[PDB]
Amino acid sequence: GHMSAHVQQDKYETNVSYKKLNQLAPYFKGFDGSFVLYNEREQAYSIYNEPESKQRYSPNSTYKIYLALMAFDQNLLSLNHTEQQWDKHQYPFKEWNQDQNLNSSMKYSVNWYYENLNKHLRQDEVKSYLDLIEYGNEEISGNENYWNESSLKISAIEQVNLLKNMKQHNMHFDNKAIEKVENSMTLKQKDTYKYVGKTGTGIVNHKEANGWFVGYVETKDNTYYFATHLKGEDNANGEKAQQISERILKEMELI
Ligand SMILES: CC1(C)S[C@H]([C@@H](C=O)NC(=O)Cc2ccccc2)N[C@H]1C(=O)O
Description:
Elements: H1 3-8, E1 18-20, E2 32-39, E3 44-48, H2 50-54, H3 64-73, H4 102-107, H5 111-120, H6 123-133, H7 156-167, H8 175-184, E4 186-189, E5 193-204, E6 207-219, E7 223-231, H9 238-251
Parallel strand pairs: 1-3
Antiparallel strand pairs: 2-3, 2-7, 4-5, 5-6, 6-7
Helix pairs in contact: 3-8
Bound molecules: open form - penicillin G.
Residues 60-61, 109, 111, 148, 199-201, 203, 237-238 line the site of open form - penicillin G.
PDB class: antibiotic resistance
Keywords: bacterial antibiotic resistance, mrsa, beta-lactamase, benzylpenicillin, antibiotic resistance, beta-lactamic antibiotics, penicillin-binding protein
Assembly: monomeric
């Protein structure tokens, strides 16, 4: 068999049409970055950096969205049962050093909460889910934490497709599971919009080398799904990805 199979698995192949967003380049100074927007009503993609929008990268903590949905679907989590007790292990982030529910664990990106979830899910069940939802390369061979700078990788465009599929009820997850998960990542809720999203950060060679912020803005007549990805030697993290996203979104007058 050919190595090329593996190279081709590292990229999402689509020839979807898109509006070019090359004027967004200044926002990504210092990074190889990408921004993907999908306008639900107009059924239209807009993209800055198409090549980077199709490169698959470890999802890191953005994977927690689907890990939670999987857990609801397996009845590991339920609508009134999202609490996990802290094992008394001291982490460098104090918010991690306490009992959690779905809301706090997503807000504070509490790794151990989601590791526990993955621990209780059958590896072959997870593989089945990743096949169903078409999660990037679907590669969980890597470690035990296959979603953290490991085997599993996904592109910005796919990140956007998955959020859209989730919201348009194209996934087989219960609507109330989706509502719980959306609430856990709801950043802002006003009369005129709901703003939802999740950061991710990956460390490679002791540096912040992989940053994500993915989510959507739901208005009174439309939904705008987005993914921002940053690749850099250092300073490529979720917070910077979110900052950039919010500048772009404000500029587009969505938030
Ligand atoms: C809050 C985090 C920095 S930790 C968590 C997870 C997921 O990506 N990332 C990591 O475990 C890698 C990491 C650990 C410590 C500092 C930076 C990245 N999520 C990060 C985020 O939301 O940006």
